[PDB]
Scaffold this motif. Structure first.
Motif, PDB file in Angstrom:
ATOM      1  N   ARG A  39      83.366  54.630  60.343  1.00  0.00           N
ATOM      2  CA  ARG A  39      84.976  54.359  59.416  1.00  0.00           C
ATOM      3  C   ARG A  39      84.780  52.314  60.148  1.00  0.00           C
ATOM      4  N   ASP A  40      84.233  52.030  59.639  1.00  0.00           N
ATOM      5  CA  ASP A  40      85.213  50.220  60.415  1.00  0.00           C
ATOM      6  C   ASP A  40      86.808  50.250  60.874  1.00  0.00           C
ATOM      7  N   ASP A  41      86.597  48.861  61.609  1.00  0.00           N
ATOM      8  CA  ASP A  41      88.059  48.913  62.179  1.00  0.00           C
ATOM      9  C   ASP A  41      89.307  48.548  60.620  1.00  0.00           C
ATOM     10  N   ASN A 251      73.731  56.798  62.542  1.00  0.00           N
ATOM     11  CA  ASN A 251      72.613  55.679  63.453  1.00  0.00           C
ATOM     12  C   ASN A 251      72.509  55.100  62.306  1.00  0.00           C
ATOM     13  N   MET A 252      71.688  55.460  60.980  1.00  0.00           N
ATOM     14  CA  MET A 252      71.523  54.557  60.470  1.00  0.00           C
ATOM     15  C   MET A 252      72.639  53.554  58.902  1.00  0.00           C
ATOM     16  N   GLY A 253      73.770  54.980  58.987  1.00  0.00           N
ATOM     17  CA  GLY A 253      74.654  55.311  58.025  1.00  0.00           C
ATOM     18  C   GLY A 253      74.200  55.196  56.683  1.00  0.00           C
ATOM     19  N   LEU A 254      72.716  56.062  56.705  1.00  0.00           N
ATOM     20  CA  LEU A 254      71.928  56.513  55.131  1.00  0.00           C
ATOM     21  C   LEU A 254      72.712  57.946  55.510  1.00  0.00           C
ATOM     22  N   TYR A 255      73.666  57.985  55.828  1.00  0.00           N
ATOM     23  CA  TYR A 255      74.953  59.221  55.149  1.00  0.00           C
ATOM     24  C   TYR A 255      73.947  60.574  53.385  1.00  0.00           C
ATOM     25  N   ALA A 319      78.854  52.732  68.112  1.00  0.00           N
ATOM     26  CA  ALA A 319      78.820  52.710  69.277  1.00  0.00           C
ATOM     27  C   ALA A 319      80.107  52.336  70.530  1.00  0.00           C
ATOM     28  N   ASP A 320      80.094  51.154  70.309  1.00  0.00           N
ATOM     29  CA  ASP A 320      80.892  50.263  70.815  1.00  0.00           C
ATOM     30  C   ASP A 320      81.792  50.330  70.886  1.00  0.00           C
ATOM     31  N   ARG A 321      82.859  50.130  69.331  1.00  0.00           N
ATOM     32  CA  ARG A 321      84.096  50.319  68.417  1.00  0.00           C
ATOM     33  C   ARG A 321      84.245  52.285  68.679  1.00  0.00           C
ATOM     34  N   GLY A 383      88.030  57.656  62.732  1.00  0.00           N
ATOM     35  CA  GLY A 383      89.469  57.293  61.799  1.00  0.00           C
ATOM     36  C   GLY A 383      90.710  56.957  62.564  1.00  0.00           C
ATOM     37  N   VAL A 384      89.928  56.102  64.300  1.00  0.00           N
ATOM     38  CA  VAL A 384      90.991  55.726  64.845  1.00  0.00           C
ATOM     39  C   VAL A 384      90.601  54.102  64.028  1.00  0.00           C
ATOM     40  N   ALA A 385      91.684  52.859  64.851  1.00  0.00           N
ATOM     41  CA  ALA A 385      91.063  51.682  64.381  1.00  0.00           C
ATOM     42  C   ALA A 385      92.123  50.950  65.064  1.00  0.00           C
TER      43      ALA A 385
END
Ligand SMILES: Cc1ncc(COP(=O)(O)O)c(CNOCC(=O)O)c1O
Ligand SMILES: Cc1ncc(COP(=O)(O)O)c(CNOCC(=O)O)c1O
Lengths: 401, 401
Positions: A39-41, A251-255, A319-321, A383-385
């Motif tokens: 999940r993004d920011d 790694n690719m978001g290919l879920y 990964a950085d996020r 789930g953390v932003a």
């Protein structure tokens, strides 16, 4: 007819339980820490930029929908092996590996499990770390194998029970199977450090065990593809011919496209061809041939220099996020005046973090703060932003003070 | 190491041998009657127009790539049941069925086989028709079941051995599992006529057997979806609760995307939910969740009136081309002065034709005319084009005179 009258309702998933409750909750501060995907920011799903581009390219080429070979898309399998082993890897250049496309990591695990059931004459015992991903049990169990365990997680410290692991593995009857997570252990986030890995290899090699690596977070963990495959490559360098499962879900978001591969390190190219023939005979009667979308997208990215480049920046972003959130969390807890030691939170790697919270505290968190997680104190860092890391720090404190 | 030294090279695939052999041939008149997929008049793969329309719709929306539920895409499964059962089927309307997405046809059959192994306590026996699709064997065998057979194909007439079938089924132990091809039997192209189907139903009902329908060619056999689902729908109407496997490989040209479904006809909605719960528990350790692409495309087409409508035109277009090649082969065989009875060619339905040719004839055909087919005398009609149907006819006459 009444053929299924004796079929009972299977048990409900505790995980689904938490997400259903989260969904009902109307407090705008609610947090879903049981989420199983990135999940993004903004707390939204994220399709990589290089994915959209790969996709767009496929459309442009007006490709057909013909059946892929049983073993899958050859451009995908080759690239998969190269990603895992490394370009200058002896294993790879000598072509003494066999890589087959599987239905993501899960399918790839299963195929590998069915392959061992059939051909691994030496033992039926599979040793899993304590604890392991829930799915690991039934996968091996359904394939017809026997389950064992080895200490791994240390609840005292929320870290590696190094002494426990070493003593356990040391007593493994020779020619048994041991499942190891390449990196970003699910569900703890507790991974051995380099030095620990080197001693682990030595004994695996000594007790002559078959090492089965589960590599579901390559690049997604540390943000570096080489760093993430380190342990696996170390084992193979020390002469341990492994078996491996790779997943591109994270790694690719290919879920949902389900792209993965199953690999067998062989003595040589001769033997690799034989194993390959046998892997094909096994897969035919399972699903005949694999889904092509995910593989096509994955192959294009890894195979296309402009895309691969963009892929590494993107994977690194993810990964950085997560690290960021981990960092922020510890710092914010201090800031709240938490006397407790929360280093584990920053020592742990990947998507999952075993907080050390006890079942009662988890309950307070849910009931009082609208923070949804499993009763084992496991949190999904996805789930953390930036907008809520503070709130979570607050609540953790309130319930730990 | 040397864990795999004892693993031997697995048998070579016959189908594959003919495609490979064909490839390596230099004749410009060479023909591949071994093709397992539909081909247009120019001998080319064919992506439906309705399919391209669907992909373009998905693209415009910018959809995520998130995991689908274990059971798959709800829009897909509902639509699948509906296409099979019929909109106003009582089984459909009461909600007493359960349909889970599978990995096309092969994957759906496998889940079904695994399910029966687990819950069908009344017997371990599965009755296949003589002959059946090769894959049918290992699917069941690997699942943990025992295979038996019933007489089906009559070599003397290259038609249905109705008598032998009727006698065989009559003697099948009660509560045994029986595999039936819904339409366009593979590999013979021999299907029971409506009236014979009605008779089979009665016997199946009486012996109280679990009928497992394999429906891989709905709409592609005869150009009519309802007509193709006739036998399936009649069993259910007669009160036989079948289980079924669907494939969208041929009918939608979704080969490599892998879109399928497994359905269980239950006593009620209540039992349907118990069954679905158990099917989820089974799939999880198999592959977690299904590939989304094919399901997305399939669902759009089935659910959008405009696309559904274009689809029915394209499917019909496909069925007719095939029927035309059959009609034209025979007529060209007569034309040639062949004195043999070739009515079977036109009597048969779908992509596959059991010609009746003997091995050595097949040999001369390959060797002398550059016509590639399996030695069982089976040909893929998809490999016949208007431009080469004359060539085929001449060759066969030559070899049979
Ligand atoms: C160590 C590990 N291996 C393998 C896998 C399998 O991942 P996938 O099948 O998505 O490739 C996972 C995936 N977990 O996410 C899926 C879920 O919990 O429902 C995993 O953590
Ligand atoms: C009766 C029948 N059932 C089931 C199936 C399975 O088809 P699919 O798995 O492609 O959906 C087939 C597919 N045959 O051709 C596929 C191949 O040989 O590769 C079939 O003929």
């Amino acid at each position: 007819s009444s053929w299924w009258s004796h079929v009972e309702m299977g048990p409900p998933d505790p995980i689904l339980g938490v997400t259903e409750a989260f969904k009902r909750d109307t407090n705008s501060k609610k947090m879903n820490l049981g989420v199983g995907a990135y999940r993004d920011d903004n707390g939204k799903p994220y399709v990589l930029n290089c994915v959209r581009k790969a996709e767009a390219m496929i459309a442009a080429k007006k490709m057909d929908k013909e059946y892929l070979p049983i073993a899958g898309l050859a451009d995908f399998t080759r690239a998969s092996a190269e990603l895992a082993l490394g370009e200058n890897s002896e294993a790879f250049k000598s072509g003494r590996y066999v890589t087959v496309q599987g239905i993501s990591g899960t399918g790839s695990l299963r195929v590998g499990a069915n392959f061992l059931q059939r051909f691994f004459k030496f033992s039926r015992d599979v040793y899993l770390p304590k604890p392991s991903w829930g799915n690991h049990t039934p996968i091996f169990r359904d394939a017809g194998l026997q389950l064992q365990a080895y200490r791994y997680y240390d609840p005292k410290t929320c870290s590696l029970d190094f002494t426990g692991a070493m003593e356990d593995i040391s007593k493994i009857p020779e020619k048994s199977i041991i499942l190891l997570h390449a990196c970003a252990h699910n569900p703890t986030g507790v991974d051995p450090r380099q030095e620990q890995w080197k001693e682990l290899a030595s004994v695996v090699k000594k007790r002559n065990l078959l090492a089965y690596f589960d590599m579901a977070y390559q690049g997604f963990a540390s943000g570096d593809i080489n760093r993430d495959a380190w342990a696996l490559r170390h084992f193979i360098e020390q002469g341990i011919d492994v078996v491996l499962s790779q997943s591109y879900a994270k790694n690719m978001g290919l879920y949902g496209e389900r792209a993965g591969a199953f690999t067998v390190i062989c003595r040589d190219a001769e033997e690799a061809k034989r194993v390959e023939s046998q892997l094909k005979i096994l897969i035919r009667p399972m699903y005949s041939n694999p889904p092509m979308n995910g593989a096509r997208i994955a192959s294009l990215i890894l195979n296309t220099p402009e895309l691969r480049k963009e892929w590494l920046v993107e994977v690194k972003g993810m990964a950085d996020r997560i690290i960021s959130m981990r960092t922020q969390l510890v710092s914010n807890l201090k800031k709240e005046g938490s006397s407790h030691n929360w280093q584990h939170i920053t020592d742990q790697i990947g998507m999952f973090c075993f907080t050390g919270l006890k079942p009662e505290q988890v309950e307070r968190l849910t009931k009082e703060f609208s923070i949804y997680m499993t009763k084992d104190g496991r949190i999904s860092v996805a789930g953390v932003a930036s907008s809520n890391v503070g709130y979570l720090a607050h609540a953790i404190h309130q319930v730990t003070k």
